[PDB]
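Methods, example record. To illustrate the input and output format used throughout this study, we show the complete record for Major prion protein. The sequence lines were provided to the predictor; the line carrying structure tokens was produced by it.
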Amino acid sequence: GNDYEDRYYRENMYAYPNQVYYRPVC
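The corresponding predicted structure is encoded as:
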């Protein structure tokens, strides 16, 4: 399985945040 922070690696790279968003900083 996997257990990260919020739940999974969502606070890193799940779908939305590729970097921050991706090109724009957010």
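Annotations derived from this record:
The radius of gyration is 10 Å.
The chain has no helices and no strands.
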